[PDB]
RNA sequence: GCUCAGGAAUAAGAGCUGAAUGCAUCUAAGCUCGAACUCUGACCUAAAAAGAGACCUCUUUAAGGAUUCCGGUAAAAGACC
């Protein structure tokens, strides 16, 4: 069917996300984390416990970038909520 | 007699994050390391840098500069002390 290039993230409770200027800011029980996710042709909005990210052209580069940004947002919220561990 | 580094950014290469391609992936964005190479740091030269410089002092019929005179740490002539 359709090649729509929109993605939702469904932010969970606790994280105070924002998209001031370009840097994407979050805060929660496990401290705060910051990141910058600016890229032409890829717009991001934060609203109602979810961040919507999409593009305009169906070129595969746009689709790859929208996937990458969605993954980064998920990992940021997940990290600020509880944290991440590595065992060696 | 003296004759070093340290740092920044990199090549081949090794990784992290990561989607197109639900997974996976060093790569497509992004990030971390990485050479006697490159840059910086030492060293020599450089207001005739035409955007032709900055600051201070002394004095504009003076400050000061040259020539003569006695010389050499300098010297082909000039210059320099």
From Swiss-Prot:
GO terms assigned for molecular function: rRNA binding; structural constituent of ribosome
Record keywords: Ribonucleoprotein, Ribosomal protein, RNA-binding, rRNA-binding
Subunit structure: Part of the 50S ribosomal subunit.
Originating organism: Methanosarcina acetivorans (strain ATCC 35395 / DSM 2834 / JCM 12185 / C2A)
GO biological process: cytoplasmic translation
N-terminal signal peptide: none
Similarity field: Belongs to the universal ribosomal protein uL6 family.
GO cellular component term of the entry, any: cytosolic large ribosomal subunit
Protein purpose: This protein binds to the 23S rRNA, and is important in its secondary structure. It is located near the subunit interface in the base of the L7/L12 stalk, and near the tRNA binding site of the peptidyltransferase center.
Top-rank lineage group of the source organism: Archaea
Protein name as catalogued: Large ribosomal subunit protein uL6
């Amino acid at each position: 069917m359709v090649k729509e290039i929109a993605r939702t993230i469904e932010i969970p409770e606790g994280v105070s996300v924002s998209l001031a200027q370009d840097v994407f800011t979050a805060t929660g029980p496990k401290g705060t984390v910051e990141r910058k996710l600016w890229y032409p042709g890829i717009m991001i909005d934060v609203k109602d416990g979810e961040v919507v990210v999409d593009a305009e052209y169906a070129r595969k580069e746009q689709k790859a970038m929208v996937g990458t940004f969605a993954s980064h947002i998920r990992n940021l919220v997940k990290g600020v909520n509880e944290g991440f561990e590595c065992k060696m």
